[PDB]
């Protein structure tokens, strides 16, 4: 069966129907779905009442999945993380970020399923690093290509938010010790498509190390604004049993925090990635 | 008939059905539509195949309408402006702005009808000055309340873009002479609801005159970024015969320029406004 | 003897003669010196061939002395910092800072003596927090008055600069434990003159806690630039045996790093102040 | 006679004695003065009781002189600007600028003489475009080299400052007509030494035309701040009959406005340069 794929804009986003994600997909179907994620960077399917087991199986056709000990997981399925936000667990994703870029091999992508939603709010936005790179002037494309930038766990999890108790402070210290800052290319080459994408994000990028500190502040301030250009984005208003699949190698996203005290439950499968690299054009 | 009103988020935006905009509305219907625009700041109705005459009549129930000599208007209807963009007439609304704030009485609102659309692209976004004001810390709310800022035609229409011919340059000079910069409150009190809203926009606001030049640059740089927070916004993907009605007193908007060389035709009715003022809380 | 006092500008700085600082001063001379420091914020005395022992003795007349947790001290004189810079110890004070604001009672004064100088370069600049406050617009004065900001030893002494050896990393660890981050007023009231002064500095101030994170970044970016205005400053070109004495309650300073591979040796004494406070007025 | 030349820093500034500038200099002395200006970028000579006529004569030895379109000149000496400031003519040069970069052949040099000074205040600072360029990272040097920027007379002489009378508004109108905006290289190659220097200045540079508007704002904001680094500068405290001679190809300067209501009178001569160019290297 041919999938129905409707682009949501010229640069990023598509809505897909004609694929039952609870049951196994044919190879032709999955090839279409795969290439649609590659091309449109994030795709959305609706009315997909998927179990954590079916979501794991779907995600595993893209690649192997992250398992966390720190987060709660679905009953009987370790690869599906339960993101259950409310007053006692406020959301922390209302900032432009690429997931876990402070490790050497950030996730290649994710599958996110909406399980329980507030009456309104909680939109999620994606922005295209490819479109943003292509919109830079030639001098800026030549400048940023080949530079390296530092990504640091502590930019999104700063020490001053973990002082409340001595145990909490020490747990933060241990996480920092396990996750020292490291470098990634400022312009990342997609390992399948070969497209060039900006690969800095306000969530974790602290410094472009191949320019001076003041030069870095100027460039990152510009770039963190540049990626907020509406032309580079798609915005999704969730309904229950929506599924979002996105490529974390060449996008950032932002999850609105505008629904507390209401409750919101998402199920996530994180697809493991490889080391980001830059291959000159 | 009671209107069906679906909010699109907790702070701004709603989709409305149950009102035929081609034919006259009952008073009860219009009271609902009016209060929904007031509350949700921008509202969207779909499948409204409205003629310019019917759009004028609808808009005139909100207030009297702007007539321009400079723009093309619909056949036989001067109050409906035809916005026909393409290669020879590129779009210029891809910047965060409040319409015509460089005059003493900026429009109170607008009704926009989608007539011909590109295959994809051309989304329009709105951001809430009310939500943005309420999200400032107390020191910033106290700081900005009562200040005045200069709005200048030339910020969106700078001289260097009008040098191509001597006639074009002189036409710009004449427009500038008719439209000198003037002041508006930084925090505007809505004249009906009494809500306080940020009332600066990157399109036209050049300087907060009650602080120093460097202080102004710092504050406006922060504020122009602050209003781009996704929680303050709604984003609309157009279909033909969509109608958008919005309150220009307490919002900004941004029209994506991501569809050239394709053609896009909108019909607009501009509702005249009064002088912005600030009334302390 | 009456002191000879020549102002170097309208807001900050004076050159003084008529006092031999290498030998005991009369109570009358000392009162004159003390009030000149308060009035001119930084004063300079030339041709003063002082020993570290004599420099400590003079500093003791102003109050109780501070022992720095990281910097090396002079042989047998624990209270005198030796700033001995060269290829093997590159300069560390080419940033705008107020000395030791990371403690509860930041130094009220300091005394600096030029011991060995390069053939050229190494100028030191002072900027007046009083002049900087008075140059703020009234709305900005009202904004900052009453706000508090965090000061952190580690901002100017980051861990990665102290990992060359176990000795220096352990000394760093002990300094951090004794000097946790703390708050000081953003506008400080001088305890003698009653004048208001800006009291943040880029060396140690990390964030303003009474506003949002993005608001804090905007305000500190402005303030760190504001104090670099030339009208707020005096610039000193050193000769051997110069002495500078300054009011560290209401100034910042900056030491040029433009002389390597040449060697430069200064001696500093550091006089504890009271707890900084703000008293509205 | 051999000139006595004392450098004031490693990068910029020297004090000179052994030359009477009020009387004719030997070709040998002149060569020494000329090469000192090139080597030290700005030089200072004290106790030089020069007349405007003598100052013009000395300036003529360097090249053809410029007559300023707006500033008043000395009686009977059209080439000597009188900068006579006080309550009725407040100072106008407390901004970082390179003199008269709004013409095709900006002055290569200038000569400033202190005629009447306030009791204190009014220091003038110079900053080196050569030092500032060398402090850029290689990627930033490569970025800016070859770019062009627009310079506009009106940035420092805006119309609203010249509407007090019809005479001054008409003089402004004629200056604008004779001095339209034009481009200069962002990195300028010194025509004698071959050194590269930054060649933008906040006084007249409006935008970098080879990048986007937002990219231009980011780069100019960085560059206008970069040149204020103290290591790039020399600061001069005037005495009557001082003379400053500087290489206006590769420096900027800034005149403190901190002495009103006291009166200050300086005389300037301004020597035309060649067309600024960039030669890669």
Best CA proximity match to D18, nearest among D32, D8, D35: D32
DSSP summary character for residue D100: T
A151 touches chain D (CB under 8 A): no
A99 a catalytic residue: yes
Say whether residue C254 is in contact with chain D using an 8 A CB cutoff: yes
Number of Cβ atoms within 10 Å of the Cβ of D40: 25
Under DSSP, the state recorded for B212 is -
B160: chain D residues, CB-CB within 8 Å: 150, 181, 207
d(CA C134, CA D270): 36
CB proximity D134 to C under 8 Å: no
User: Which string of b and e fits A69-81 if b means at least 16 CB within 10 Å?
Assistant: eeeebbeebebbb
Binding-site residue positions of A for 2-oxoglutarate: 124, 253, 264, 268
Cβ of D148 under 8 Å from any chain A Cβ?
no
Contact status, residue A2 vs residue A18, Cβ threshold 8 Å: yes
Any idea which residues of C carry the catalytic annotation? 97, 99, 253, 268
> Do residues D107 and D176 touch, judged by C-beta distance below 8 A?
no
Active site residue D97: yes
Question: Distance from C152 to chain A by nearest Cα, in Å?
Answer: 11
Q: Which residues of D touch A226 (CB under 8 A)?
A: 214
CA distance D181 to chain B (A): 9
**Which is nearest to A20 in space by CA: A243, A218, A179?**
A243
Distance between start and end Cα atoms, chain A:
37
| DSSP string over C99-145 | TTTTSSS-EEEEEEEEEE--SS---EEEEEHHHHHHTS-HHHHHHHT
The position carrying tokens 């003897």 is C1
3-state secondary structure of A27: helix
B-chain residues within 8 Å CB-CB of C211?
137, 139-140
Which of A41, C142, D256, C22 shows the shortest CA–CA distance to B147?
Answer: C142
Instruction: Report all structural domains of chain C as residue ranges with CATH numbers, in order of start.
Output: 1-281 (3.60.130.10)
DSSP strand pairing (D233-236 vs D42-45) = unpaired
Q: Which residue from D minimizes the CA distance to C125?
A: D230
List of residues 6+ apart from C178 with CB closer than 8 A:
C69
H/E segment holding residue D266: strand D264-272
Q: Is B172 on the interface with A (CB under 8 A)?
A: no
Q: Which residues pair with C126 in a beta bridge?
A: C234, C253
Which residue out of A40, A97, A184, A188 is catalytically annotated? A97
Exposure b/e, B56-68, CB count within 10 A at least 16 = b: bbbbeebeebbee
Complete DSSP assignment for C39-78: HHSEEEE-S----HHHHHHHHHTTSPBP--SSS-EETTEE
CA–CA gap between residue A260 and residue C217 (Å, rounded): 26
Give DSSP secondary structure letters for A93-162: --S-B-TTTTSSS--SEEEEEEEE--SS---EEEEEHHHHHHTS-HHHHHHHTT-EEEE-HHHHS-GGGG
Instruction: Give the Cα separation of C199 and C130 in Å (integer).
Output: 9
Does D100 count as an annotated binding residue? yes
Resolution of the solved structure (Å): 1.7
Pairing of strands A187-189, A196-198: antiparallel
- D123 to chain C, any CB pair closer than 8 A? The answer is yes
Residue B218's closest chain D neighbor by CA?
D221
- Mutate which of C138, C209, C218, C229 to disrupt the B interface (most B C-beta within 10 Å)? C218
Cα–Cα distances (Å) from D46 to D16, D17, D18, D186, D237, in that order, read 8, 8, 10, 34, 11
Q: How was it solved?
A: X-ray
Compute the distance between CA of residue D89 and CA of residue B38 in angstroms, rounded to an integer: 52
Which residues on chain C are in Cβ contact (under 8 Å) with A160?
Answer: 150, 181, 207
Residues in chain D closer than 8 A to C8 (CB atoms): 120, 237
Cβ pair C258:D11 closer than 8 A:
yes
Range list of β-strands (E), B215-274:
233-236, 243-247, 251-255, 264-271
The count of other CB atoms within 10 Å of the CB of residue D202 is 21
Give one DSSP letter per residue of B140-190, joined into a string.
HHHHHTT-EEEE-HHHHS-GGGG-SSHHHHHHHHHHHHHS--EEEESEEEP
């Amino acid at each position: 069966e041919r999938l129905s794929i409707t682009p949501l804009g010229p640069y990023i986003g598509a809505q897909i129907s004609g694929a039952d994600l609870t049951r196994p997909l044919s190879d032709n179907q999955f090839e279409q779905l795969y290439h649609a994620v590659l091309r449109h960077q994030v795709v959305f399917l609706r009315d997909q009442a998927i179990t954590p087991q079916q979501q794991r199986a779907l995600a595993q056709r893209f690649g192997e999945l992250h398992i966390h000990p720190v987060y709660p997981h679905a009953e009987g399925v370790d690869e599906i993380i339960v993101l259950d936000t409310h007053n006692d667990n406020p959301p922390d994703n209302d900032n432009w970020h690429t997931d876990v870029t402070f490790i050497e091999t950030p996730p290649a992508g994710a599958i996110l399923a909406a399980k329980e939603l507030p009456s309104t709010g909680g939109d999620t936005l994606w922005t295209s690093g490819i479109a943003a790179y292509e919109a830079l002037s030639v001098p800026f494309r030549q400048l940023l290509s080949g530079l390296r930038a530092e990504h640091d766990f502590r930019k999104s999890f700063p020490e001053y938010k973990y002082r409340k108790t001595e145990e909490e402070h020490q747990r933060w210290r241990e996480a920092v010790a396990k996750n020292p800052p490291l470098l990634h290319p400022v312009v990342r080459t997609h390992p399948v498509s070969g497209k060039q994408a900006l690969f800095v994000n306000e969530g974790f990028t602290t410094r472009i190390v191949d320019v001076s500190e003041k030069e870095s502040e100027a460039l990152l301030s510009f770039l963190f604004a540049h990626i907020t250009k509406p032309e580079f984005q798609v915005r999704w208003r969730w309904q229950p049993n929506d599924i979002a699949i996105w490529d974390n190698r060449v996008t950032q996203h932002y999850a609105n925090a505008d629904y507390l005290p209401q409750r919101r439950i998402m199920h996530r499968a994180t697809i493991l990635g490889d080391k980001p690299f830059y291959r000159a054009g």
